Specification:
Organism (chain B): Escherichia coli
Oligomer: homodimer
Shape of chain A: flat
Protein name (chain B): DUF305 domain-containing protein
Domain DUF305 (chain B): 1-83
Helix content of chain A: over 70%
Keywords (chain B): Plasmid
């Protein structure tokens, strides 16, 4: 399915998308709703960054290229926030 | 197929989203593929964030969900305006 594509850009947009979506779908089956959100949203953010990276490789529109840049920066930072929350949310408050 | 009411709601719509996004990115124009694919992906994030506001009990993740909804909605508006101009 990822092997049927109109163009190099579409091949790259599709590459990894199924695995990312399967990762999202499985991750949100975590029963703790906040942990499901963090794990699902990290997976979503991974997919957003990948799509934005492909737009920077192949895009030829200045507005969409700039938006792709901005999405990458913001999504990376939110992944960092979510990972820190996942690592630290069970720590004892002293 | 799911552990909980919250997980059932998180999963709802995600399948049709993968198919929708695979189709969207098969536009030959790479910037249009990006805009259509990313609108769909933003819609997925908004749906997940809404479910986190409905079921979540952690203040930090609830605040992040609220911020994501606002930002993604704004970027959807930008991408739609760009699509209309491109047409």
């Amino acid at each position: 399915m990822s092997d049927m594509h109109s163009s190099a850009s579409s091949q790259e947009y599709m590459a990894g998308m199924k695995n990312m979506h399967e990762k999202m779908m499985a991750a949100v089956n975590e029963s703790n709703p906040d942990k499901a959100f963090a794990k699902g949203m990290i997976a979503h953010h991974e997919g957003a960054i990948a799509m934005a990276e492909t737009e920077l490789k192949y895009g030829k529109d200045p507005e969409m290229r700039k938006l792709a840049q901005d999405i990458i920066k913001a999504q990376k930072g939110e992944i960092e926030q979510m990972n820190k929350w996942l690592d630290s949310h069970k720590l004892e408050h002293h």
